[PDB]
Short mmCIF file of C-alpha atoms and ligand atoms in Angstrom, two decimals:
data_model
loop_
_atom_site.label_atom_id
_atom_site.label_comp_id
_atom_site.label_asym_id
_atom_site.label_seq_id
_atom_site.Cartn_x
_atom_site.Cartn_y
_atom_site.Cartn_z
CA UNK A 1 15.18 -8.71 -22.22
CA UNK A 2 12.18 -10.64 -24.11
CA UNK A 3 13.26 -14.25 -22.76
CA UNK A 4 11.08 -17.46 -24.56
CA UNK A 5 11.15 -20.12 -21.82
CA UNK A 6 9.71 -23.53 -23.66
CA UNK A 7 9.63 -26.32 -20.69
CA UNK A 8 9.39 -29.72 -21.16
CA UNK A 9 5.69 -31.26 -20.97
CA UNK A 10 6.30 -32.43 -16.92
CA UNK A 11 5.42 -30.26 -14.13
CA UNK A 12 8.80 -30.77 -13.15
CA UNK A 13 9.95 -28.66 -15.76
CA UNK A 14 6.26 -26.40 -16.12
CA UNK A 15 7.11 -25.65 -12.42
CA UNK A 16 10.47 -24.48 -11.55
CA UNK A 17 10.38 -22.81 -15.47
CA UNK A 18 7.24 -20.73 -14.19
CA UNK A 19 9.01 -19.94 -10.93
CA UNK A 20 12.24 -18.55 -12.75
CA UNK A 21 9.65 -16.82 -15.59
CA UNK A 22 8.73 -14.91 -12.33
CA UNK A 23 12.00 -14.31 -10.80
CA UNK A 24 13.05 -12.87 -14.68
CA UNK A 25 9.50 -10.52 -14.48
CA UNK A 26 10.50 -9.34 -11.00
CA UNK A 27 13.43 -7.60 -12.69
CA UNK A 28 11.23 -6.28 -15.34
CA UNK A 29 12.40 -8.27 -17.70
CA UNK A 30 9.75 -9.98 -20.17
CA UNK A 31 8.78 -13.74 -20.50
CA UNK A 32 6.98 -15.71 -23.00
CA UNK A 33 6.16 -18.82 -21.39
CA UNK A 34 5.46 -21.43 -24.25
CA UNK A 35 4.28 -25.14 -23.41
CA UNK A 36 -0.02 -26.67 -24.27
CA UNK A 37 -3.18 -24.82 -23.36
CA UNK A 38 -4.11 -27.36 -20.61
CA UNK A 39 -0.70 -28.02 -19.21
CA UNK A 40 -0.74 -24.11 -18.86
CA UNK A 41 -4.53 -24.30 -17.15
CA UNK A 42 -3.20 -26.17 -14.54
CA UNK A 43 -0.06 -24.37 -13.36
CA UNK A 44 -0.17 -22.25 -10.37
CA UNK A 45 -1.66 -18.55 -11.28
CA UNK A 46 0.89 -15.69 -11.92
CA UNK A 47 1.40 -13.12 -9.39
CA UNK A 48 -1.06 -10.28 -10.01
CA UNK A 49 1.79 -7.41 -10.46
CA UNK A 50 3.67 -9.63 -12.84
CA UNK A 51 0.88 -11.02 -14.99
CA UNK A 52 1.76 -8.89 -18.49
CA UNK A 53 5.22 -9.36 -18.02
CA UNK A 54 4.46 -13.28 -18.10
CA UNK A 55 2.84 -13.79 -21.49
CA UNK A 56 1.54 -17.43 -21.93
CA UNK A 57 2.04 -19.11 -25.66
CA UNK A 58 -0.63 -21.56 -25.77
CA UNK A 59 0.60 -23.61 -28.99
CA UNK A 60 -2.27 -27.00 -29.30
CA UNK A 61 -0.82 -30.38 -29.37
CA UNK A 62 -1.49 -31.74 -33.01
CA UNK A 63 -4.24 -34.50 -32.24
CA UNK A 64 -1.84 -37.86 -32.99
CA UNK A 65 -4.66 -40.56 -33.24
CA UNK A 66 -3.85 -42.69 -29.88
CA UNK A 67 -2.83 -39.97 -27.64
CA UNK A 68 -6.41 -39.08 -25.93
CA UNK A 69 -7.09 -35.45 -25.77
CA UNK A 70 -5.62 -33.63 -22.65
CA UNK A 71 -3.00 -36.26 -22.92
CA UNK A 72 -1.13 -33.14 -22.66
CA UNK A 73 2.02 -34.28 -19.56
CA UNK A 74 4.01 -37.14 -18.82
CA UNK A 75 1.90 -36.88 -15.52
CA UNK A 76 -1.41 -37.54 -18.12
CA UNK A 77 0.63 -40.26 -20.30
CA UNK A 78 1.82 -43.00 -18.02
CA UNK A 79 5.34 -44.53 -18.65
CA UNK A 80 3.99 -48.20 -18.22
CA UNK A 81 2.40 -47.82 -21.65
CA UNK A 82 5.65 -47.29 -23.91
CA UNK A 83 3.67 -46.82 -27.02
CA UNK A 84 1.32 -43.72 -25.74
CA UNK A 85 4.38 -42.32 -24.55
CA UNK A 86 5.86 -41.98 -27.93
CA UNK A 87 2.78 -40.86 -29.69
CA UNK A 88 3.32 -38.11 -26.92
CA UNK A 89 6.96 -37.17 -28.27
CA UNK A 90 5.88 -37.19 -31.73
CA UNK A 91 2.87 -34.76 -30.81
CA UNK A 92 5.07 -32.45 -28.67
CA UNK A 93 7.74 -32.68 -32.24
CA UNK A 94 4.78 -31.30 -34.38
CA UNK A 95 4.87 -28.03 -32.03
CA UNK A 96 7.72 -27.40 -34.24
CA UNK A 97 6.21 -25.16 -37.15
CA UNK A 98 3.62 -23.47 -34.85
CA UNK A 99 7.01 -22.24 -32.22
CA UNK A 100 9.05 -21.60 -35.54
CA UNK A 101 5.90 -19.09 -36.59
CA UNK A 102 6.17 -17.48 -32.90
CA UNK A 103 9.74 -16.95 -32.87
CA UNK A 104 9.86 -15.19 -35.82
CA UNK A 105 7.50 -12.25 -34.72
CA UNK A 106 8.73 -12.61 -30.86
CA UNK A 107 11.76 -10.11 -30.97
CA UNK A 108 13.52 -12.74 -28.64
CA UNK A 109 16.93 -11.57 -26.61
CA UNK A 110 17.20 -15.83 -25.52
CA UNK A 111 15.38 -18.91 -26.05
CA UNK A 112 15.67 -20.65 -22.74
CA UNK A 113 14.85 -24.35 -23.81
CA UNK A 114 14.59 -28.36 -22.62
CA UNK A 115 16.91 -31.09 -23.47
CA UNK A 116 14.20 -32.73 -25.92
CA UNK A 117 13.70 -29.49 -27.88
CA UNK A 118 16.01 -29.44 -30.49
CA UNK A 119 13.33 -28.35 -32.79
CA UNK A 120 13.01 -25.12 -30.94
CA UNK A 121 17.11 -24.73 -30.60
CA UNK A 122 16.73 -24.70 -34.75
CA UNK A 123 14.05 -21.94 -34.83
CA UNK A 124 16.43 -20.06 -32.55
CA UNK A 125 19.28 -20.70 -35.06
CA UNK A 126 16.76 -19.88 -37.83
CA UNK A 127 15.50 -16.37 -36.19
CA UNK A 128 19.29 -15.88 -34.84
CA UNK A 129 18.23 -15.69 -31.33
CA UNK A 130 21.16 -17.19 -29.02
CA UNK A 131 19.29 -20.45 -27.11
CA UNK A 132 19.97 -21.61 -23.84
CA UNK A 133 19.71 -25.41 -23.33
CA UNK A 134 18.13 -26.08 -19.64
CA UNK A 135 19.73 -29.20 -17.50
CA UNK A 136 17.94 -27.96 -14.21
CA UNK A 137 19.57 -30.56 -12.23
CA UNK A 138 22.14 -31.49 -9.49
CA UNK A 139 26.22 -30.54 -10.77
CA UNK A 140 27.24 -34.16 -9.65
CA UNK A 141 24.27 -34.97 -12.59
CA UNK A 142 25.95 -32.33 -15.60
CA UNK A 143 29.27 -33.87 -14.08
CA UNK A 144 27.69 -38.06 -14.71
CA UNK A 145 26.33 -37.29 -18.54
CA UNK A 146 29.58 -35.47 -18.89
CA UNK A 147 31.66 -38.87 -18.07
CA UNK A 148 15.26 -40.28 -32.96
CA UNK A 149 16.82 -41.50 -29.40
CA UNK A 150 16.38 -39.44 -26.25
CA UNK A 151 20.49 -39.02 -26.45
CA UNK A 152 20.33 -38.27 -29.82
CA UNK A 153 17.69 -35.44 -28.88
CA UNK A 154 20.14 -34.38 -25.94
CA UNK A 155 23.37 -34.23 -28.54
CA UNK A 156 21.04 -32.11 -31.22
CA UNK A 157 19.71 -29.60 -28.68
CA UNK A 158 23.25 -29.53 -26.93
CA UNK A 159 25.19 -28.77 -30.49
CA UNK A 160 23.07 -26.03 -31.44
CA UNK A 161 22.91 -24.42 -27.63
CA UNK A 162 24.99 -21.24 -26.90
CA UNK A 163 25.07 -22.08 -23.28
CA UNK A 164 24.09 -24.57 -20.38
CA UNK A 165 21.58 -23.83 -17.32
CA UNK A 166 22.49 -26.10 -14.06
CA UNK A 167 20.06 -25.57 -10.94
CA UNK A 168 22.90 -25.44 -7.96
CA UNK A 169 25.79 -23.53 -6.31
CA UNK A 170 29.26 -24.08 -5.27
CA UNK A 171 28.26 -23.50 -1.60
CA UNK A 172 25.59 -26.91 -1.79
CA UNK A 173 28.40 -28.78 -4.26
CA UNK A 174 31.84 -26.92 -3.83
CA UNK A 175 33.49 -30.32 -4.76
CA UNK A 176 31.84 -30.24 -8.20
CA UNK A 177 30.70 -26.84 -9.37
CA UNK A 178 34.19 -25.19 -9.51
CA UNK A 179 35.81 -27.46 -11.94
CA UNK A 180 32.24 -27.77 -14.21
CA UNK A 181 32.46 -24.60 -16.48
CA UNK A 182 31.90 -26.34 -19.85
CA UNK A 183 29.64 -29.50 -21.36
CA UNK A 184 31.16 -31.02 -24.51
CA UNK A 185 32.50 -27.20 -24.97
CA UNK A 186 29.29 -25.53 -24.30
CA UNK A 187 29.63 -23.46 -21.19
CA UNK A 188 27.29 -23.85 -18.09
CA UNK A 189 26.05 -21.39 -15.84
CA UNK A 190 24.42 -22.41 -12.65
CA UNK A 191 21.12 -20.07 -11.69
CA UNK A 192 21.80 -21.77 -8.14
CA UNK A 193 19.05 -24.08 -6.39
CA UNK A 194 16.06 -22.22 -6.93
CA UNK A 195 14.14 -23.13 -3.66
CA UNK A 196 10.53 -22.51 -4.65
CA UNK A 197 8.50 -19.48 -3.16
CA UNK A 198 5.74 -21.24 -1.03
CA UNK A 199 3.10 -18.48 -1.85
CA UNK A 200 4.09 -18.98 -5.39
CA UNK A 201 2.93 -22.26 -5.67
CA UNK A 202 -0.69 -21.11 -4.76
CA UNK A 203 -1.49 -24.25 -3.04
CA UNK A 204 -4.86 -25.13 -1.10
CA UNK A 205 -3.53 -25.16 2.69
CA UNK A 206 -6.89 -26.58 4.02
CA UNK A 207 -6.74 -29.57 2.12
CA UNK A 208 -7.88 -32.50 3.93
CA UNK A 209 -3.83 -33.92 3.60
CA UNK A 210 -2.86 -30.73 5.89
CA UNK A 211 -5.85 -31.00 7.83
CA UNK A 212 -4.80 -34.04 8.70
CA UNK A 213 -1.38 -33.46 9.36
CA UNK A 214 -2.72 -30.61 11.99
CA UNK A 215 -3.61 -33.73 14.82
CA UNK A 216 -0.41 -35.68 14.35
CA UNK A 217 2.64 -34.63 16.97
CA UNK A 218 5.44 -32.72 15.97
CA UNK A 219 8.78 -34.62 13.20
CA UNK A 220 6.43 -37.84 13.65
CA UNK A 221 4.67 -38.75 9.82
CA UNK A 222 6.89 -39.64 6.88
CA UNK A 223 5.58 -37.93 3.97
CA UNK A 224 5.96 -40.49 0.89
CA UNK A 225 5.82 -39.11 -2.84
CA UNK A 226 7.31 -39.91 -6.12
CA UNK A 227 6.77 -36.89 -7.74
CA UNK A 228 4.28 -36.16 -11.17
CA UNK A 229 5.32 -39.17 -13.43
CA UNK A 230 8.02 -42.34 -12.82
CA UNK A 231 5.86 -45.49 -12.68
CA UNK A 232 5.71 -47.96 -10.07
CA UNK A 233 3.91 -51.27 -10.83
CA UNK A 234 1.11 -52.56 -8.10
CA UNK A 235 3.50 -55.12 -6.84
CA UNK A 236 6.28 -52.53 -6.01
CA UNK A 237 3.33 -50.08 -4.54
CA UNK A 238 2.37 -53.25 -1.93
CA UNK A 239 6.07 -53.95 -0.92
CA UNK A 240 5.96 -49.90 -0.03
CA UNK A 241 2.93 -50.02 1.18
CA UNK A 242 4.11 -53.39 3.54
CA UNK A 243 7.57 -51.27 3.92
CA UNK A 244 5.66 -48.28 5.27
CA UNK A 245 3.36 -50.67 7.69
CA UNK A 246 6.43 -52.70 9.10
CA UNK A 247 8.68 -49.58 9.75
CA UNK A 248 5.52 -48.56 11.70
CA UNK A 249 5.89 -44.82 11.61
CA UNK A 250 3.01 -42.09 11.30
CA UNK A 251 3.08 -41.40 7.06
CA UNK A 252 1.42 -39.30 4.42
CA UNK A 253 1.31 -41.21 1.02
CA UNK A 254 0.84 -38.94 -2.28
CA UNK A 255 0.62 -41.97 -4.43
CA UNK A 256 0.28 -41.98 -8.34
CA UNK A 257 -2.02 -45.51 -9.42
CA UNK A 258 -0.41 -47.41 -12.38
CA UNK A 259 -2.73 -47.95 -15.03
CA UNK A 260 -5.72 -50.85 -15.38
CA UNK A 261 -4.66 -50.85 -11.29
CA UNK A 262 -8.60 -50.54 -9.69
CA UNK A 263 -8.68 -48.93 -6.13
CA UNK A 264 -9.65 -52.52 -4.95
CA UNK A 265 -5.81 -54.08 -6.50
CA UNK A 266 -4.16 -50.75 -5.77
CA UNK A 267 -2.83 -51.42 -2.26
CA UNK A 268 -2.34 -55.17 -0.29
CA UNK A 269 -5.44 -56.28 1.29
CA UNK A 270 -6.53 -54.78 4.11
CA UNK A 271 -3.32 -52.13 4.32
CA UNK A 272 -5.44 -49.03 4.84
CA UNK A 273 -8.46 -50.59 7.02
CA UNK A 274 -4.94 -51.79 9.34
CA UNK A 275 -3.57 -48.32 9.04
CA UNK A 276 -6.32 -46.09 9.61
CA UNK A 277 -5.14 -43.74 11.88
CA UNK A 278 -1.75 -44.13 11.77
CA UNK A 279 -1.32 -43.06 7.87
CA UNK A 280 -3.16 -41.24 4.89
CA UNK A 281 -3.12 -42.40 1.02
CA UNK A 282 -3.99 -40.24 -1.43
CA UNK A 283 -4.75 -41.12 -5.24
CA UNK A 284 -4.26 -37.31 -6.27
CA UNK A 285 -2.29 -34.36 -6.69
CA UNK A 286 -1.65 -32.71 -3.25
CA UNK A 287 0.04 -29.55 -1.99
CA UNK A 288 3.44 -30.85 -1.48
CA UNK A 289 5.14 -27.67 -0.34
CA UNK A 290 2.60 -27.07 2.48
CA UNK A 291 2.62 -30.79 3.57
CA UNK A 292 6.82 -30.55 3.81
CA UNK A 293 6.14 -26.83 5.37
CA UNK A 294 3.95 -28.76 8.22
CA UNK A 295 5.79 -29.52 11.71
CA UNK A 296 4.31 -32.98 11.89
CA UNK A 297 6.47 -34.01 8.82
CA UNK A 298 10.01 -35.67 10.02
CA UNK A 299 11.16 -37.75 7.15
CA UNK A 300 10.74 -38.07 3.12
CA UNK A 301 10.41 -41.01 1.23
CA UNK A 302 11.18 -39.45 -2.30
CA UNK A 303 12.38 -40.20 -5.68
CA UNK A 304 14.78 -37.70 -5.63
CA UNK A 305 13.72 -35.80 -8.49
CA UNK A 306 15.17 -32.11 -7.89
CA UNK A 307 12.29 -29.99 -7.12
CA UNK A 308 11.22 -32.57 -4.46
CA UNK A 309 14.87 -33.05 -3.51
CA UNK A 310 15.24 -29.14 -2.87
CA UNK A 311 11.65 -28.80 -1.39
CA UNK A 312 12.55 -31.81 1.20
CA UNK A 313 15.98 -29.76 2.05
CA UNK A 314 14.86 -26.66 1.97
CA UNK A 315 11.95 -27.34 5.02
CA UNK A 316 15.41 -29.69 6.89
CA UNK A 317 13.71 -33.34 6.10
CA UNK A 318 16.17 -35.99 6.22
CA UNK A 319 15.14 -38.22 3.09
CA UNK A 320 14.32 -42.01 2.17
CA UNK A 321 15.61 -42.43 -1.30
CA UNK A 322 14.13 -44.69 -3.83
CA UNK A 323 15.10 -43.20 -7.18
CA UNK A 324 13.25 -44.90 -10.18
CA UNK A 325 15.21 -43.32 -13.11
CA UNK A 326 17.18 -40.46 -15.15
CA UNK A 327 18.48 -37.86 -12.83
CA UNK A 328 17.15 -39.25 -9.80
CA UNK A 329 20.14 -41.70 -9.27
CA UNK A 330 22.91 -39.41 -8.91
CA UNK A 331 20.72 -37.15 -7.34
CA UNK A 332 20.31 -39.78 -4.62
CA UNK A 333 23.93 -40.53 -4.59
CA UNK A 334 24.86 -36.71 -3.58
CA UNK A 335 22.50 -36.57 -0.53
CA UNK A 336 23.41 -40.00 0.64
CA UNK A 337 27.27 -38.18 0.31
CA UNK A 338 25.89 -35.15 2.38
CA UNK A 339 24.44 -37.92 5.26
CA UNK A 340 21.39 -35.93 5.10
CA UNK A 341 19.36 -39.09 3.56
CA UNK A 342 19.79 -43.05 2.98
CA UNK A 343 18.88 -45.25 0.01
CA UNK A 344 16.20 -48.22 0.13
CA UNK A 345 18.38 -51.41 -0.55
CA UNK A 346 18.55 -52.09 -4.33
CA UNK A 347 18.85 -55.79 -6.04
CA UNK A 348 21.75 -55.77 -8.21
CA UNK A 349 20.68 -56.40 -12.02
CA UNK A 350 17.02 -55.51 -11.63
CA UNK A 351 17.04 -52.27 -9.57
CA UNK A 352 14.04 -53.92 -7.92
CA UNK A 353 13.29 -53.49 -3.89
CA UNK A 354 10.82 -55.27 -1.33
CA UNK A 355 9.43 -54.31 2.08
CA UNK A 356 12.20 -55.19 4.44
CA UNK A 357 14.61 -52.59 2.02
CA UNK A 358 11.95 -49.96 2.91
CA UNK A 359 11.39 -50.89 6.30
CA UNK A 360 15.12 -50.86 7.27
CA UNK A 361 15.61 -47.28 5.69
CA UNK A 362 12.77 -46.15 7.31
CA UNK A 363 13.81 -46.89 11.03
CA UNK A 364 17.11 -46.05 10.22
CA UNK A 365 15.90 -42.13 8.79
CA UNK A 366 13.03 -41.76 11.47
CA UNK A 367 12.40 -44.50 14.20
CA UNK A 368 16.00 -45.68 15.44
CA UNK A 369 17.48 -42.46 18.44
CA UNK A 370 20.62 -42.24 17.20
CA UNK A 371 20.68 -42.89 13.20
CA UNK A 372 17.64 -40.87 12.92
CA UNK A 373 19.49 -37.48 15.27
CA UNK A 374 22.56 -37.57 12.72
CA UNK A 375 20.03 -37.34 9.87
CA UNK A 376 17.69 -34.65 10.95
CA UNK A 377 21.14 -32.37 12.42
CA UNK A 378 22.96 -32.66 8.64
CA UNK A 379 19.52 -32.16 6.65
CA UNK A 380 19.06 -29.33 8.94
CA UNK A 381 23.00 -28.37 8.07
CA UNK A 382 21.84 -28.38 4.30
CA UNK A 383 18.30 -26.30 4.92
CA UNK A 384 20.76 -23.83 6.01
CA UNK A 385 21.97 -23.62 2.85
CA UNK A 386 19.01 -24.63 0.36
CA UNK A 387 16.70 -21.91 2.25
CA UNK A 388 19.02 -18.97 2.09
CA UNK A 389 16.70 -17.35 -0.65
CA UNK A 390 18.53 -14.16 -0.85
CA UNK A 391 22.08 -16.03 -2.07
CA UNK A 392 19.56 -18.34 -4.35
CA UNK A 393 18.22 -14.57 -5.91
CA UNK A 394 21.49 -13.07 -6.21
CA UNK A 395 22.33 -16.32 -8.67
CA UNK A 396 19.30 -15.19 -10.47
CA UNK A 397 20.72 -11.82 -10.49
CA UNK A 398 24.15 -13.80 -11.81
CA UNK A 399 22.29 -15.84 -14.51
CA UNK A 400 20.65 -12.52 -15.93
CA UNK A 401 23.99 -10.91 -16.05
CA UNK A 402 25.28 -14.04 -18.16
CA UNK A 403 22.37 -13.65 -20.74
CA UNK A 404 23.13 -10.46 -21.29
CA UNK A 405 26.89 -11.08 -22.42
O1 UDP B 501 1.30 -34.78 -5.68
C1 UDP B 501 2.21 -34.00 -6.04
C2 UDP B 501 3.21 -34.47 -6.88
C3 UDP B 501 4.22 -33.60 -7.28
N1 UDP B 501 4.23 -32.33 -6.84
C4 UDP B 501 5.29 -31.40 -7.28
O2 UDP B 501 5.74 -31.73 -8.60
C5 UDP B 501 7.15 -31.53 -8.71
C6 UDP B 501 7.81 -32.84 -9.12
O3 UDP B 501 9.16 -32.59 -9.51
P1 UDP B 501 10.35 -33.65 -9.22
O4 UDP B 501 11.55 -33.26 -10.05
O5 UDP B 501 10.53 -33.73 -7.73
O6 UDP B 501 9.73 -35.03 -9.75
P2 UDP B 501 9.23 -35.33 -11.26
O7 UDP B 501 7.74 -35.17 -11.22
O8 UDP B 501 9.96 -34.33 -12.12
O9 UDP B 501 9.64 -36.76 -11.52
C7 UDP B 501 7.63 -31.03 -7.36
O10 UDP B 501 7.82 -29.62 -7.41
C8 UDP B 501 6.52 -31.39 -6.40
O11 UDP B 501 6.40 -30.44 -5.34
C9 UDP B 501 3.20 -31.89 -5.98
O12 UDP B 501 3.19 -30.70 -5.57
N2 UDP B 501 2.23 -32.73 -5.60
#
């Protein structure tokens, strides 16, 4: 099959979507991967062998005075700027004619598409190509939505979608996935979890983050990330910054700044001078499946989006929940279910947190003998299940099958 994949502008969706573009290649099938020209430069390479049956559809965001050129991600447009953020949707809405144009001319099998594409779900109506909406999340999150406006998006794309792609399996949610065969009538198929393949990701493994990670004892640093894009204000970054401190542990901080944060503001006075050998902040992008890969990782502080979710599982890392918003919730919710992970205390009303929240997860996940043994053994009981990769490519194999009834 010709299969268009068109992820949404986040490398949570770019990466997982070029992971399963592979896994379709692999059984000689043929992808078009469409998303922006720089989003695209900045994705992991294509495996050599696989690189014509991968074809990448550049389309140019139209310039939207206000959006800054390269402004291409939500990782590039932060969330604590609402307006930029829009001007971003409205630029990603005029990719409409251009992917209309390219759809025509693909000779398309599927159109395998995001929630917020319901421009592309009408070019598949248009050019009669059956289209595929993606909801690469948790079951327990189809099963919580199951129970122009972002929702209207989701109903538009939804309506005009043939069928529904979940990223799970009844053996990691048996209590959900059986009974979750339709969404508003649409039916789902789940592709299973979709571990990523560490070479895949064509990280740098002598990065100074792994380097560093090298000279620290075995299960002792809590890596800390919040994935590509949620926001965190520099008064929530000090009271998990003072959090990490208190709790004392060995840690590994990927940290995204807020914006008009200098590197002076960024962190509490004095935090990294006090921490110097004891933890690492970094202000970039850093290999996240080789730093999770690394023995001297124990625990993850996360914000439970999926990819990080499964990557954290998938290497047996207990996790530290602090979920900021959308999917991360429930996806928080279902670990804390599995006792494989514990949520950072919440204030009711304002879903805000402080230090001693952090602090207390933390020595509950990673410092405290006992707590910390009944994490590690059921986060080890899920890796057994999240790193099969063979039963994770035979629901590949499944999800193929599906497209082609
Ligand atoms: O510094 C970083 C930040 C993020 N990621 C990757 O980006 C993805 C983030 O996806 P997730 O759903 O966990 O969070 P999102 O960014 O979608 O909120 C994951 O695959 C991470 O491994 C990374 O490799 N390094």
């Amino acid at each position: 099959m010709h299969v268009v994949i068109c992820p949404w502008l986040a490398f949570g969706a770019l990466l997982p979507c070029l992971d399963l573009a592979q896994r379709l290649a692999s059984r000689g099938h043929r992808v078009s991967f469409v998303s922006t020209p720089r989003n695209i430069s900045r994705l992991p390479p294509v495996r050599p062998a696989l690189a014509p049956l991968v074809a990448f559809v550049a389309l140019p965001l139209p310039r939207v005075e206000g959006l800054p050129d390269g402004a291409e991600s939500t990782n590039d447009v932060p969330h604590d700027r609402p307006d930029m953020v829009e001007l971003h949707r409205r630029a990603f809405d005029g990719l409409a004619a251009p992917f209309s144009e390219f759809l025509g001319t693909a000779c398309a099998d599927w159109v395998i598409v995001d929630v917020f594409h319901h421009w592309a779900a009408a070019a598949a109506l248009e050019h009669k190509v059956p289209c595929a909406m993606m909801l690469l999340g948790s079951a327990h999150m189809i099963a919580s939505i199951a129970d122009m406006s972002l929702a209207e998006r989701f109903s538009l794309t939804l309506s005009r979608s043939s069928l529904v792609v979940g990223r799970s399996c009844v053996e990691f949610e048996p209590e959900t996935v059986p009974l979750l065969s339709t969404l508003r009538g649409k039916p789902i198929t789940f592709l299973g979890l979709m571990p990523p393949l560490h070479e895949g990701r064509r990280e740098d493994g002598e990065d100074a983050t792994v380097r560093w990670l090298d000279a620290q004892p075995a299960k002792s640093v809590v890596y800390v990330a919040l994935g590509s894009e949620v926001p965190l204000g520099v008064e929530k970054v000090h009271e998990l910054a003072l959090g990490l401190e208190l709790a004392g542990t060995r840690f590994l901080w990927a940290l995204r700044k807020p914006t008009g944060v200098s590197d002076a503001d960024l962190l509490p006075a004095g935090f990294e001078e006090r921490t110097r050998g004891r933890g690492v902040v970094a202000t970039r992008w850093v290999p996240q499946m080789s730093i999770l890969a690394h023995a001297a990782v124990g625990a993850f502080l996360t914000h439970c989006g999926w990819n990080s979710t499964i990557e954290g599982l998938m290497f047996g890392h207990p996790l530290i929940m602090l979920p900021i918003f959308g999917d991360q919730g429930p996806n928080a919710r279902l670990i804390e279910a599995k006792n494989a992970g514990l949520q950072v205390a919440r204030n009711d009303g304002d879903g805000s947190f402080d230090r001693e929240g952090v602090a207390a997860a933390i020595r509950a996940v990673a410092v405290e003998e006992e707590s910390s043994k009944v994490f590690q053994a059921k986060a080890k009981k899920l890796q057994e299940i999240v790193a099969d990769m063979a039963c994770h490519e035979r629901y590949i194999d499944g999800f193929i099958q599906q497209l082609r009834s």
